[PDB]
Design a protein around this ligand. Structure first.
Ligand SMILES: CCCCCCCCCCCCCCCCCC(=O)OC[C@H](CO)OC(=O)CCCCCCCCCCCCCCCCC
Ligand SMILES: CCCCCCCCCCCCCCCCCC(=O)OC[C@H](CO)OC(=O)CCCCCCCCCCCCCCCCC
Ligand SMILES: CCCCCCCCCCCCCCCCCC(=O)OC[C@H](CO)OC(=O)CCCCCCCCCCCCCCCCC
Ligand SMILES: CCCCCCCCCCCCCCCCCC(=O)OC[C@H](CO)OC(=O)CCCCCCCCCCCCCCCCC
Ligand SMILES: CCCCCCCCCO
Ligand SMILES: CCCCCCCCCO
Ligand SMILES: CCCCCCCCCO
Ligand SMILES: CCCCCCCCCO
Ligand SMILES: [K+]
Ligand SMILES: [K+]
Ligand SMILES: [K+]
Ligand SMILES: [K+]
Ligand SMILES: [K+]
Ligand SMILES: [K+]
Lengths: 105, 102, 102, 102, 102, 105
């Protein structure tokens, strides 16, 4: 099955900087990657679908990019509410799989 | 309703083809999910796949790997080929009648 | 038996096509085994390959690499194209006769 | 101008097909640029893609990944299949008339 | 020689198609050599490529990348599609004449 | 030809644990992998066909998973009769090939 690798597992950044989460698939999956945010004791929340497509209700500072095997989730000017775990998910091949997750500091 | 049979059947084949494309899309996804490595597993691209399958184009970007996905594929091919063949037959009948009058 | 010739031949082409698909599947595997890298080497997927070949779809998931596998492929293509073409011709003959009566 | 209808329509389908190939090439590139990973993004190969699409060949070397690129593709397929089908219908009408005289 | 026109033309299309397949094979290799990465560069597989191209199958195992290789390809497609379409038209003419007698 | 690599060659496990044998192909072979069991001085016996499909007569604790290049044979709660050599075999491309085998301890 498709392995999604999120490295590093922890990103530490100063308030206001631009941060980039990395997601790498074990094989080409076009743009079939989706991003989720999970805060402490919360349910996951969709941030970006199909690598770059924005979702209504999500702050404009969230963006996504990449295609093939390497994907990036970016936050322009990180603020306190962005503190959470970030997961990528592929829907290119069955079964759907999740990345291991990156924590934001 | 006494309009030409060849145009009625052609219309019927078109409507039926659209139904096959939609049903084919639905049934392919239903069949292909559960099979490791299968790519024909979301509806929008499944409909695109059905189109190239019915026209016999295929490109190879998407295709079924399961028995039931392939059976669905064969139905889509036959329905597509028959439909276009029925249009051609209708066109011939039109031309033949018009050449008699000419 | 004086039923319409075009429907008889169409039926005959269909039955013959099914025979070609089964024989094609068998002969392709027989031809392709022994060739390093060949993928058309088990019967179930060989029949699936024969279907997309006869309809001219293809996808590119399977294809012969040997001389005799390719010859078998060509027979399958021609039989498929001829069969569907014979159905279309039968459909035209039907429509033409019915438009005369109309 | 009282030349045979089947030859006029066949000519019209050919000219229209050429227009579809050129417009299809232009619109596919316009649709596919902006989509990461898309290969149908320069005009010369887009015209080549349109040709294999209209003939239903496909090879799989090029294909659209966007919604609008795929819609353009479907138009190209249908126009191609209809055009060739219209030629076949015209050929049949010719043969039928000539066999009556023979 | 007063045999049916539709059978004569069908025979002519077949012979011409065989010529196109052989000439297409030769000209494709001549066109594709000199282009880095080209796979359509030896005659035996070029003839196989011509066959799947003329039938519109495609598999995607082989295809031209040059301008002149692609032009040769288009000629092969059209000749193939026209030839099979001419056979279908001949079959229709046969069935139509026989249904009048029946 | 297709190389199938089974590593490690020896798996040592406590009675009752879940064990996983690994089989890796040198190229993508879909799900065309089959698993066999060979006990001491015995003939090989089919356990799993097409990566995950079960065989009648084989205990339910045997399962298989994977697709592409990486395949796994798993035993839920290993017991004494499971002591044997385990082989994978591919049928995707000619000629069929075998893995080097993993011994269970
Ligand atoms: C009509 C076309 C449907 C054929 C699809 C082939 C099954 C593909 C598959 O993924 O099937 C999946 C499944 C594998 O577990 O295949 C199976 O067993 C399915 C059992 C039926 C398969 C057809 C029988 C082969 C006939 C070959 C000719 C033999 C005489 C010559
Ligand atoms: C009808 C289509 C069959 C052609 C299959 C090509 C052989 C593929 C192969 O894997 O064949 C395998 C085998 C290689 O060992 O090829 C061979 O030698 C087979 C000998 C016959 C090949 C055809 C001759 C080429 C004619 C090209 C035109 C030359 C004049 C212009
Ligand atoms: C006529 C063929 C056009 C279908 C192209 C599929 C869209 C591909 C894409 O890249 O679309 C891109 C875009 C993804 O962001 O897809 C979308 O949402 C586009 C919305 C429309 C998609 C078609 C709806 C699916 C119908 C399936 C049947 C459901 C009932 C059974
Ligand atoms: C009939 C189909 C032939 C088209 C083959 C495309 C050339 C492929 C190539 O490998 O060509 C190779 C060569 C690149 O060096 O391409 C070239 O320049 C060749 C010049 C002619 C290319 C066609 C012009 C493009 C027309 C697009 C529509 C524009 C208006 C809309
Ligand atoms: C002919 C269409 C039938 C679709 C059946 C879906 C297959 C179920 C998978 O077990
Ligand atoms: C026309 C079909 C003949 C099939 C022959 C199989 C090839 C034998 C391989 O040496
Ligand atoms: C039917 C052809 C329409 C082409 C439209 C191009 C798509 C624009 C991309 O947003
Ligand atoms: C229409 C066929 C012409 C073949 C010409 C070969 C191309 C020469 C490469 O410069
Ligand atoms: K085709
Ligand atoms: K194809
Ligand atoms: K392909
Ligand atoms: K056709
Ligand atoms: K095709
Ligand atoms: K293809």
């Amino acid at each position: 099955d498709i392995l999604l690798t999120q490295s590093p597992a922890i990103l530490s950044v100063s308030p206001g900087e631009r941060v980039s989460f990395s997601c790498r698939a074990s094989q080409s999956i076009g743009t079939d990657i989706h991003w989720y945010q999970q805060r402490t004791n919360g349910s996951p929340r969709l941030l970006i679908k199909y690598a770059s497509e924005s979702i209504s209700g999500i702050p404009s500072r969230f963006s996504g990019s990449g295609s093939g095997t390497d994907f990036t989730l970016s936050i322009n000017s990180v603020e306190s509410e962005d503190i959470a775990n970030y997961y990528c998910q592929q829907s290119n091949r069955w079964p759907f799989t999740f990345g291991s997750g990156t924590k934001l500091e | 309703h006494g309009s030409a049979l060849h145009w009625r059947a052609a219309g019927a084949a078109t409507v039926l083809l659209v139904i096959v494309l939609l049903a084919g899309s639905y049934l392919a996804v239903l069949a292909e999910r559960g099979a490791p490595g299968a790519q024909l597993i979301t509806y929008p691209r499944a409909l695109w796949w059905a189109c190239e399958t019915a026209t016999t184009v295929x490109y190879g970007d998407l295709y079924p790997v399961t028995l039931w996905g392939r059976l669905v594929a064969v139905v889509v091919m036959v329905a597509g080929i028959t439909s276009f063949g029925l249009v051609t037959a209708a066109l011939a009948t039109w031309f033949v009648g018009r050449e008699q009058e000419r």
